[PDB]
Amino acid sequence: AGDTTITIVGNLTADPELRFTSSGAAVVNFTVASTPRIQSGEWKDGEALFLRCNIWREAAENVAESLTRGARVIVTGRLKQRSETREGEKRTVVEVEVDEIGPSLRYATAKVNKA
Template identity: 75%
Template sequence: MAGDTTITVIGNLTVDPELRFTPSGAAVCNFTVASTPRAFDKQTNDWVDQETLFMRCSVWREAAENVAESLTKGTRVIVQGRLKARSYETKEGERRTSTELEVDEIGPSMKYATAKVTRKQPGNGQNTAQGGYQPQGGGNTRPQSSGPSQGQPWGQQQASYDWGAGNDQEPPY
């Protein structure tokens, strides 16, 4: 959205992500990322940890379920999202504001780890407005395939053009 403050935070999950569901059935996953910047101290000729930022994060819907299933405490992650300020009142009547990151994208950092990605079919009958291209009808649309075939990681169909057949037609590009 225009005017939103978008940031990227790289750090470690402080606890296992907590998955909950709203009364309407929407999944929400909450977690905290600890990000500690480092600076080089010329006097000691060593790297020194700076003050740690603890960023409270929330992610919604299918992505929330994926996060809860895939990430655990201590995992180094890259989180991108929009800063949101929430105002609330304490039991004592004091007005407070907290800042949290409404996550758009999250993934494990590959700097010190490896990961095996398992693609899920979008939607599973639910609204998939969170990320990904969704055709809106009208125009030229093709029916969705049932998923990528073996050896075709991007789900593209194999071209049926035989380059050695001596055909006079143009190549398929």
């Protein structure tokens, strides 16, 4: 495909927002806040990066069932650009189409249940 991929580690800013399309397909959107650590090297919170993420179907439902606001997650996916409404100003935004997502075990444990 030649897609631009990314791995992002961070915290969900809110509970995953679950919605179903007309066809019945689940769609979930959420924002990952990634805070780098940056006389100050790795011992001061840097400016956060906020990336909106989209995930679909069974993986979306898995996420809606498992994750909540503030959860630390590891996300891999592909960078996508999405484009107004009632203002005229036609703006583009970069988002992540999620390939895999999981809760990080850095500060937490998890009980996994396979589909």
